Design a protein around this ligand. Structure first.
Ligand SMILES: O=C(O)[C@H]1O[C@H](O[C@@H]2[C@H](O)[C@@H](O)[C@@H](O[C@@H]3[C@H](O)[C@@H](O)[C@@H](O[C@@H]4[C@H](O)[C@@H](O)[C@@H](O)O[C@@H]4C(=O)O)O[C@@H]3C(=O)O)O[C@@H]2C(=O)O)[C@H](O)[C@@H](O)[C@H]1O
Ligand code: CA
Ligand code: CA
Ligand code: CA
Ligand code: CA
Length: 352
């Protein structure tokens, strides 16, 4: 089945006619994708020659650890990333338990891509787009069960004063349908875009069962389109959470917010505020703010905060099937299903 619990409906490379390959390193992944574009005669086949399931067994802990020991040395280095460009036959990159990477995965003009069980952290090249996961002009992409991390910190002297590290999951362009789920994202400043500029609006994105801890902003930075965020655990948000911009619409359901600043907002543009439909979150009314350490701040440009904690608009009927557990069960159970080494385990009501 292609059920991702979100707008994306894909099985990645786990489809009929697929070929399985094991990659012991980043270069092997690169070589495996290259080889998968050629037919029996060595001639290139558009979109790839056949579906692919790449099991990555490499471990770059030493690179991740050294980086964590000198974070301000990362931004100026060369970014590292496995590119998945114009591969539409269906592909899955799944890390084996114990695997890790100090390089990211950049999806571009592709479709039917799945990234699971990848432990990616402290990537070099924040000044040159060194993303952990990038989804550009790519619909039906599922980013599931990964651990994306760095340090939620800004070193001095970086370009635009914000490139110490790049994103956990940036989504831009015509990535019309994407599902980001069960990811353990921690120590990340600019978590993930959903449109890279004011003009890059649209897409239908679903963020579910993700565990965010000690993150600054962009959960996501939404521009137009639809965003369905449900069953997420947002703890220690130091800047802002869901920022609904350029008339985007969000459905924020059954999430747990705690020790968070500006959890639901629409800021930094000064106009075209998006809307949100709130329901079943641990926060039900403004009186719950103190209980969950929820604070609010202003901005120099006109903005809208969910400080009345009420819906500011509507949201279309959710297309796909999903069954959210309670916000309490998220708080209680999510940490055991989110991230890597969980065998892609999902949280259901029976496990609450
Ligand atoms: O695809 C990409 O990676 C993408 O990266 C850049 O675009 C990102 C945003 O789309 C862009 O709007 C901008 O974000 C600004 C600001 O530059 C960023 O530092 C952050 O700043 C806010 C606030 O405005 C600041 O005054 C201060 O208080 O810090 C805030 C914060 O959130 O920490 O967010 C801003 C915003 O939300 O608009 O830059 C982004 C980035 O990743 O730096 C490139 O511009 C784009 O071309 C593309 O490469
Ligand atoms: Ca980026
Ligand atoms: Ca910037
Ligand atoms: Ca950026
Ligand atoms: Ca921002």
């Amino acid at each position: 089945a292609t059920d991702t619990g979100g707008y994306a409906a894909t099985a990645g490379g786990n489809v009929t006619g697929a070929v399985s390959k094991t990659a012991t390193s980043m270069q092997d992944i690169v070589n495996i994708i290259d080889a998968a574009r050629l037919d029996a005669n060595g001639k290139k086949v558009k979109g790839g020659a056949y579906p692919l399931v790449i099991t990555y067994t490499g471990n770059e802990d030493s690179l991740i650890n050294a980086a964590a020991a000198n974070i301000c040395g990362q931004w100026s280095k060369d970014p590292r990333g496995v590119e998945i460009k114009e591969f539409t036959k269906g592909i899955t990159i799944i890390g084996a338990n114990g695997s890790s990477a100090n390089f990211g995965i950049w999806i571009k003009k592709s479709s039917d891509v799945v990234v699971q069980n990848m432990r990616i952290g402290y990537l070099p090249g924040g000044a040159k787009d060194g993303d952990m996961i990038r989804v550009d002009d790519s619909p039906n992409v599922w980013v599931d069960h990964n651990e994306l991390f760095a340090a939620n910190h800004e070193c001095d002297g970086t370009p635009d004063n914000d490139t110490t590290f790049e994103s956990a999951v940036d989504i831009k362009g015509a990535s019309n349908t994407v599902t980001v789920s069960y990811n353990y994202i921690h120590g990340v400043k600019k978590v993930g875009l959903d449109g890279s500029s004011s003009s890059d609006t649209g897409r239908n994105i679903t963020y579910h069962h993700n565990y965010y801890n000690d993150v600054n902003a962009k959960l996501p930075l939404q521009r137009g389109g639809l965003v369905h965020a449900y069953n997420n655990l947002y703890t220690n948000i130091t800047g802002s959470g869901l920022n609904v911009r350029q008339n985007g619409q969000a459905l924020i359901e059954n999430n747990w917010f705690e020790k968070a600043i500006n959890p639901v907002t629409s800021r930094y543009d000064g106009k075209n505020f998006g809307t949100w439909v709130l329901k079943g979150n641990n926060i039900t009314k403004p009186a719950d703010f103190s209980t969950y350490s929820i604070t609010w701040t202003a901005d120099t440009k006109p903005y809208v905060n969910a400080d009345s904690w009420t819906s500011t608009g509507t949201f279309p009927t959710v297309a796909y099937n999903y069954s959210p557990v309670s916000a309490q069960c998220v708080k209680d159970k999510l940490p055991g299903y989110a991230g890597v080494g969980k065998n892609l385990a999902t949280l259901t009501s029976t496990a609450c």
